Amino acid sequence: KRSKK
Amino acid sequence: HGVCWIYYPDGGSLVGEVNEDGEMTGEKIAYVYPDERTALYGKFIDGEMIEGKLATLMSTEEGRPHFELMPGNSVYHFDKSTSSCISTNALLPDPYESERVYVAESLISSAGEGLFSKVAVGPNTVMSFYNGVRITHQEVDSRDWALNGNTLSLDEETVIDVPEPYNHVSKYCASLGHKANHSFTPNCIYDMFVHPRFGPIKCIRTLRAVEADEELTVAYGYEAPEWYQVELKAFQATQ
Ligand SMILES: Nc1ncnc2c1ncn2[C@@H]1O[C@H](CSCC[C@H](N)C(=O)O)[C@@H](O)[C@H]1O
C-alpha cells in the first residue's frame, strides 16, 4: 500500500 | 536448424539458432530491444545473457538478422537484483535507455530532479527501465513513507526499490525509471518488462506522443505522502 501501483 | 525469434509482450525479443536441445545457446545469440534496432549480441545460455555486446540490427533476410557491433568494450550480462544487491555495475547505463531519456531539474515546482525525453516518439514507446532491489510488501508497508519514495510494486509478491544512496545518479545510473515524477495527467505508465540484464522489472512506456525534452510523468497510483495529498487536492480543483 506504500508503493506505486 | 533455422532461426528462431521469441518476442516478449513488451516488444523486446531473443533471436538465434537453437542447439540440438532446442535452446538459445551459443556465441551468436541476441536480445533485441523494442525499437527492433538496438541489440545485445553475444554469448547466451538457454536464453540467458552471459556476455552481450552492444550492436545494431542492420536488417533481416528471411528471418536471418545482420548485426554490426558498436565500437567499445562494454559487455553486459544477466544481473538480476536481490534484496541487497541492486547491480554488479551500478554505473554502467543501459544503452537503449541512455539514448532516450536524461535526468535534469524537474519542471514541477519543488519536485527535485525529473526524467526527460531526448527524442520525439509516438504512443506506446518504451523509454526507461525501473530496476531496483527486490523486497516484500510487508517490509515496505511496515516502514515510514520517508523510506518509500522509490518503491514500485512489481507484482503481488515483489516490490522494487531504489534506496539511498542509489537514488542519486552519481551512485546509480544502470536504470533511471525511478526519476520520473508524478502527475495526475501523465504522459507515461509503468508497464511489465523482461530485461536481458535486469530480468523481470517494470518500464516506463509512453501513453501518447512525447516531444524531445518533454518531462516524462507517471501516475503513482497511491494513504500517501503529504506532497501527494496536497497535489491531489490542488488537482481536484482547477480541473
Ligand atoms: N508531482 C510531484 N510534486 C512534488 N514532488 C514530487 C512529485 N512527483 C514526484 N515528486 C518527488 O519525487 C519523489 C519520487 S522519486 C522521483 C525522483 C525525484 N524527484 C528525485 O529528484 O530523485 C517523491 O518522494 C517527491 O519528493
Domains and CATH numbers, chain B: 1-78 (2.20.110.10), 79-221 (2.170.270.10)
Locate the ligand 1 atom nearest the alpha carbon of residue B225 and give its number. Answer: 24
Q: How far apart are CA B214 and CA B212, in angstroms?
A: 6
- The answer on whether B231 is annotated among ligand-binding residues is yes
B72-87 per-residue burial string, b: 16 or more CB within 10 A, e: under 16: eeebbbbbebeeeebb
- B47-53: Cβ within 8 A, 24+ apart: B47/B6, B47/B14, B47/B23, B48/B78, B49/B76, B49/B77, B49/B78, B49/B196, B49/B197, B50/B77, B50/B78, B51/B75, B51/B76, B51/B77, B52/B76, B52/B77, B52/B196
Resolution, expressed in angstroms to one decimal: 1.6
Q: Determine whether the interchain pair B152/A1 forms a contact, defined as Cβ–Cβ distance below 8 Å.
A: no
Could you list the beta-strand ranges (E) of B62-187.
64-69, 75-76, 101-105, 113-117, 126-130, 133-135, 152-153, 159-161, 181-182
Q: How far apart are CA B230 and CA B46, in angstroms?
A: 49
Contacts of B181 in chain A (CB under 8 A): none
Nearest to A4 among B137, B141, B221 (CB): B221
Of B77, B96, B81, nearest to B12 by C-alpha is B96
Q: Determine whether the interchain pair A4/B140 forms a contact, defined as Cβ–Cβ distance below 8 Å.
A: no
The grid coordinates listed for B232 are 491531489
Are the CB atoms for B8 and B201 separated by under 8 Å? no
Instruction: List, as ranges, residues 63-102 from B with C-beta within 8 Å of A.
Output: none
Q: Which amino acid is at B5?
A: W
CB-CB neighbours of B238 under 10 Å: 5
| Cis, bond preceding B165 (omega within 30 deg of 0) | yes
Q: Determine whether the interchain pair A2/B223 forms a contact, defined as Cβ–Cβ distance below 8 Å.
A: yes
The grid coordinates listed for B127 are 523509454
Q: How far apart are CA B173 and CA B221, in angstroms?
A: 25
**Looking at the complex, does the CB of residue B235 fall below 8 Å from at least one CB of chain A?**
no
Q: How was this one solved?
A: X-ray
The sign one gets for the Cα dihedral B74, B205, B15, B25 is positive
Cα dist from B70 to B48, B58, B78, B108, B116, whole Å? 21, 12, 20, 37, 25
Protein residue with least CA distance to atom 6, ligand 1: B111
Q: How far apart are CA A5 and CA B101, in angstroms?
A: 22
